Structure 1
Amino acid sequence: VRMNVLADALKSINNAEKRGKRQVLIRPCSKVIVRFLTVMMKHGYIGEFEIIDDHRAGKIVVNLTGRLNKCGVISPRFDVQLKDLEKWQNNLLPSRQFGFIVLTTSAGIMDHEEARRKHTGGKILGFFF
């Protein structure tokens, strides 16, 4: 059954990105999906999206732009420390000039550079470049 909503959302986003569509319909939303999409907005990979509020579980319509290569989700949520982040940087990113790792820290959902800036670590969520 449906067990990882975020993996399904990024899989649909990546599939419609490879297809070439301009709008993506994610059927189940979550707070984690909202924070992930906010990070992808603030780093300039996706456009301006919506939350379709119904009374069961909201839908999300994402305005796409042609700047996205791949969106992936690491399952399960492996706990990573600050000394173990560089291992993920070399075996997950395509380059050091770009690419970001979204990880769940206690200060909030954020990328790896802000995680190094606030001097904290957490659990893995995914990646985008």
Structure 2
Amino acid sequence: VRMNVLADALKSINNAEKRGKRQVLIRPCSKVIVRFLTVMMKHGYIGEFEIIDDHRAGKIVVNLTGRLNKCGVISPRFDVQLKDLEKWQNNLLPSRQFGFIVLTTSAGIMDHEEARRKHTGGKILGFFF
């Protein structure tokens, strides 16, 4: 039984990007998935994506061009403070120049850099680079 729509969507998009496909459809749609894809688009990693509506659950098609090594998920949603952000990002990212970590926050679902800028923490969602 599907326990996490986000994990399946991330695994599917990772497989599609690794194979070399140009676009992939995700069967389950949720708001957090839309926010995370929007984070990717704002950071400039994926292209235009099309949410398709039905009366049961939406579907999402993503324009993957060339810029994803992989993009994944951490479960469960571990809670992280500001002092623990550095420890997570040293052993979670390939380097310090690029790569981002997203985490849910009451001020908005944003990356680690914006969370540090606004001086807030929350629950970690995943990473992409």
Same fold at TM > 0.5: yes
- SS of equivalent to 1:46: coil
Provide Cα deviations, 1:10-49, integer angstroms capped at 9, x if missing partner. Answer: 1000000000000010010000000000000000111000
Displacement of 1:114 in angstroms is: 0.3
TM-score by length of 1: 0.99
In 2: Cα distance, 1:89 partner to 1:61 partner: 29
Provide Cα deviations, 1:53-76, integer angstroms capped at 9, x if missing partner. Answer: 000000001111100001110000
Provide Cα deviations, 1:69-107, integer angstroms capped at 9, x if missing partner. Answer: 011100000000000000111110000000000000110
TM-score by length of 2: 0.99
- How much identity, in percent, do the aligned residues show? 100
In 1: Cα distance, 2:19 partner to 2:80 partner: 33
Task: Mark the runs of 5 or more structure 2 residues left unpaired by the alignment.
Answer: none
Could you say which residue in structure 2 is the equivalent of 1:85?
Answer: 85
Displacement of 1:52 in angstroms is: 0.7
Give the number of aligned pairs.
129
- SS of equivalent to 2:52: coil
Runs of 4+ in 1 over 3 A off after TM superposition: none
In 2: Cα distance, 1:102 partner to 1:13 partner: 17
- SS of equivalent to 2:124: strand
Displacement of 1:124 in angstroms is: 0.6
In 1: Cα distance, 2:8 partner to 2:57 partner: 15
CA-atom RMSD, angstroms?
A: 0.4
In 2: Cα distance, 1:38 partner to 1:119 partner: 21
Could you say which residue in structure 1 is the equivalent of 2:32?
Answer: 32
